[PDB]
């Protein structure tokens, strides 16, 4: 369901109608300290110019970087969101797959931080994100 | 345009409806050398499982809103612009009604441009910035 | 003493002992909702080019929206922390002065914002900053 | 050189021990092009007021060794290099020992270069990161 972490029986959300499903977003692998994701590149991920938006790999790094951090912390009663989100883009991508990893770095009471790598069919580095997690109290 | 976005050229690789902007409702209402405007009506599309807007939903309308506006002054120069750096901060969530943007164009040089962009509910509250920076260069082709 | 706000009868670094007080770094105003700092080039300010360093312009920015944060909320029992400093350059400073605003933004109960301009003796925008300052309860 | 900076020219506009960096006392270790090292001892001139390490010390130290890094490569082909971006996370406080900082390489653009900054302390934990943007364009003079 994307594969995203699969840590309590309702979600607001159906995967399919999310920004994540629309786009397709899908997650591979997820550990408390690595997780990876990827996206077939489509129209839906593309701006008007026929790359790849600059947005879509700011989501991708966004989601991955937060559900890896749910996976963790849910099931303590926390909720996690993203905080700060820094993206920065080297090379465009005009077709194939957005391959991201994030590699956590910090993971502390409050704030986990994660740096993201979002990388084309052919493995070179087209965009990083520098994740910051904020971990609160779930709300009643 | 569609979307309104600035119309600079006759064609485009891909058609609004068909793009993430089109695709999330992103819609540009002011546009000016110095600030643009643009909002979009929140619906389940622009959301995280979670019911709220997702955080890569303003990263993206803050990029398409602060490149695009830089676009309109550059392209009839012969200039491409694409975003080099977009850092995103999160001050309180949206679940429903609208995310109004503002883009605030504050250096404007040779080879980047950068904008503050600011992401508002409904009620006028910010709710997450964006400074935007974007490369300009020569037109490849 | 800089003219930092005065909080507590006590600090561990006299001023101009500090990294602030040796670079020559000077609080003019300080409101809850703004504040203002400004420093003389000198060689201490700059790299080995000439130019002032760009560090000096995030020290600046770092204190300003820090102190700015620890003015409000030290005596409600809170420290003030940066947590990220997000500086961008956009035009160098060989000489003068360099002067900062800070404007806060969002002032939350776990997180401050502030926006930095760092203007040249011209008034010309050399660089911004994007202070996000932690509060958190102070320890024992 | 003094700090051990990288040494690309025989006269530099301000001697080593006058700067930022020779005053707080920042000192270079390893230099590759695609990784450096810097460390510093930590007095009170690198502190804030309350005693831990100023948050400006680690964007400083990241900015002079990102920058110097990628001059040891330009320099030479005729170009400077100076900080473009510098985004520093804090994630735990230094009160006293070193700092120390590793620059990785992880782009080597034809006009920006960006380097990951880990800043340890003598423990080995990561106290802080410093995302290092640098503009690389030809010299002027
Ligand atoms: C920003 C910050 C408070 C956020 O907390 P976090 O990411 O949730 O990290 P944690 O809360 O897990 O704690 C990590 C370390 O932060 C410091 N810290 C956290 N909360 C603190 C508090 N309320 N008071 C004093 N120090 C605190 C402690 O050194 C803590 O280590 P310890 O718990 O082993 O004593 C913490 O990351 C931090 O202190 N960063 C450094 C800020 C800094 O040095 N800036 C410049 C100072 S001049
Ligand atoms: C990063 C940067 C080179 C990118 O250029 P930009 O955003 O396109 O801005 P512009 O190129 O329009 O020019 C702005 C100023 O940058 C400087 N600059 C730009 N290119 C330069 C070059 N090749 N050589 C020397 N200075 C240059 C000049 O001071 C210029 O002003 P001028 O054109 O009136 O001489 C420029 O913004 C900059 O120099 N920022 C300051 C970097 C800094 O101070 N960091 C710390 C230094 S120790
Ligand atoms: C990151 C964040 C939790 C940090 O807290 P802060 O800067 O200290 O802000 P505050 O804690 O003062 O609270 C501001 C709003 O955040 C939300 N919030 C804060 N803590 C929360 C928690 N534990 N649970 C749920 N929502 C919370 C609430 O909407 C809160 O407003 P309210 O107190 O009027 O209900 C808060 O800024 C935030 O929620 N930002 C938005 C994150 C986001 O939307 N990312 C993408 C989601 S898909
Ligand atoms: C921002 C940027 C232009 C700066 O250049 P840089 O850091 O110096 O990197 P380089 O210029 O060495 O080149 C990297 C790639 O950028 C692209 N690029 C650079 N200049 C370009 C130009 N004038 N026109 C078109 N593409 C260009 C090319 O794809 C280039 O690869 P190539 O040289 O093998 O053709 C470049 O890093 C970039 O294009 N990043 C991607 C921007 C992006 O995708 N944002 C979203 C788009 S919708």
Chains 1, 3 share one sequence.
């Not at 994540?20 to 550990?31: P, R, S």
């Not at 994030?102 to 087209?126: K, M, N, P």
Request: charged residues 20%; hydrophobic residues 40%; glycine residues 8%.
């Amino acid at each position: 369901g994307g594969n995203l972490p699969d840590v309590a029986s309702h979600y607001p959300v159906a995967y399919e109608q999310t920004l994540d499903g629309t786009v397709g977003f899908v997650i591979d692998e997820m550990t408390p300290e690595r997780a990876t994701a990827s996206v077939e590149v489509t129209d839906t991920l593309r701006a008007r110019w026929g790359l790849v938006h600059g947005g879509a790999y700011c989501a991708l790094a966004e989601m991955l970087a937060t559900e890896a951090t749910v996976a963790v912390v849910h099931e303590k009663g926390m909720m996690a969101v993203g905080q700060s989100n820094h993206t920065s883009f080297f090379r465009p991508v005009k077709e194939g797959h957005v391959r991201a990893e994030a590699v956590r770095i910090h993971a502390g009471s409050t704030t986990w931080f994660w740096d993201v790598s979002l990388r084309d069919d052919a493995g070179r580095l087209c965009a990083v994100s520098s994740m910051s997690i904020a971990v609160r109290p779930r709300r009643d």
